[PDB]
Write a protein that binds this ligand. Sequence first.
Ligand code: NAP
Ligand code: UV8
Length: 316
Amino acid sequence: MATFVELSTKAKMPIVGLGTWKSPLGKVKEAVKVAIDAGYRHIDCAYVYQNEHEVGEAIQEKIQEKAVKREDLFIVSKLWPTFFERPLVRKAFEKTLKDLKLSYLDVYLIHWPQGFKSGDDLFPRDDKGNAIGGKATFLDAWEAMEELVDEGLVKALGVSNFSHFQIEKLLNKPGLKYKPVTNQVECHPYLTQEKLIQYCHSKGITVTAYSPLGSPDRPWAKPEDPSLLEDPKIKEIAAKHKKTAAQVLIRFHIQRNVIVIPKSVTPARIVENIQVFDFKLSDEEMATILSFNRNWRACNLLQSSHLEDYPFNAEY
Ligand SMILES: NC(=O)c1ccc[n+]([C@@H]2O[C@H](COP(=O)([O-])OP(=O)(O)OC[C@H]3O[C@@H](n4cnc5c(N)ncnc54)[C@H](OP(=O)(O)O)[C@@H]3O)[C@@H](O)[C@H]2O)c1
Ligand SMILES: C/C(=C\c1ccc(C(=O)O)cc1Br)c1ccc2c(c1)C(C)(C)CCC2(C)C
C-alpha cells in the first residue's frame, strides 16, 4: 500500500506505479493482476505499447472480483506524436480508452514533444531511419486533449520527455485551459534530473521517473553502457539495508517525492518492487546516490534530433 504525491488538482497519484512498456501479450495481464494484489494502484500505459487491450482485461477482472474499486485505481495513458492533429487526438484516445475498457483516464500525457508524420504509421522514418516530422505541434495536440478533460473523459493532462523550455512554451501559451500535472521523464542515479525536478516542482508539476532500473532489457544495450542493478556502489547501499538494488533505486525517487514506475512481468519482482515502504535511505546515502549523476540516458533511441522541439539538447 503506497503513499501518494498530491497533484495541483488535489488528486492523489500513487507514488509507485507499474510500467507496461514491452510487457508481452500473455504476460501483461498476469502482471497487472499480481500488481493489484500486491497493492499497486497506479498503472502506466501507452497507445504505442500496443498492449492496452490486455491491461484493460486485467483491470476489469480485478474490479469484477472486488479486489479494487475504479476510483482507487490511477490509470495513465499517452498520446503518440503521429496523432497531434486534432481529429486524430480524439480517435487515438478513443482506441486507448476502448482497449483499457475504462470510462475515464486519470491522466493523459503527451508521449513525446515532437510531432511525427500524422496517421497510423507509428514510426514514420526515412531509409537511414531518421523520423519523418509532421506539421501538427504539441500545442495543437494539447488543445484537443483539453476537450477530453472538459467532457470528463480525462481527469488531468500531462507531458512526457519535455525539457523545461517546452514546459514554459506550454505554460506560457495564451488561453491555456489546463496545466500539466506531471512530467514523465527518465530518472535514476546516472540521470538525476536535479534542475528539471526543481523546475517542475516550482511550477506545481510533479515528476514521474521512468526506467528507474536503467531499463536493463533494452535491445540497444551495449555491455559498455553502465548497469545500475550491477553497480557496486548501489549494491553497497542495498546491502546496508538488507534490501535489493532494485528496491534502493525505487526508494531513491520516493524520498525526492518523485513518482516512479518500474516495469516488470515477473510476479516475484512486481512484489519486490513495492516492498519499499519499510526502510529509509539516510541523508548521506541519498547524497551518495545523487553524486552518481552522469547525465546518461538509457532512453533516446530516437533519431529525431533534426526535428523542431527535440527535448534532450537543452541543459534541462
Ligand atoms: N514516457 C516514455 O517515453 C517512457 C519511456 C520508457 C518507459 N516508460 C514507462 O516506464 C516504465 C519503466 O521503465 P522501463 O520499462 O523502460 O525499464 P525499467 O523499469 O528500468 O526496467 C525494466 C526491466 O527490469 C527488469 N526488472 C524489473 N524489476 C526488477 C528487479 N526487481 N530486479 C531485477 N530486474 C528487474 C524487468 O524484467 P521483467 O519485466 O522480465 O521482470 C525489465 O527487463 C515502462 O514500462 C513504461 O511504462 C515511459
Ligand atoms: C521505440 C520508439 C519510441 C518509444 C517507445 C516506447 C516508449 C515508452 O514510453 O516506453 C517511448 C518511446 Br519515445 C521509436 C520512436 C521513433 C522511431 C523508432 C522507435 C524506430 C527506431 C522504430 C525508427 C525511427 C523512429 C524515429 C521513427
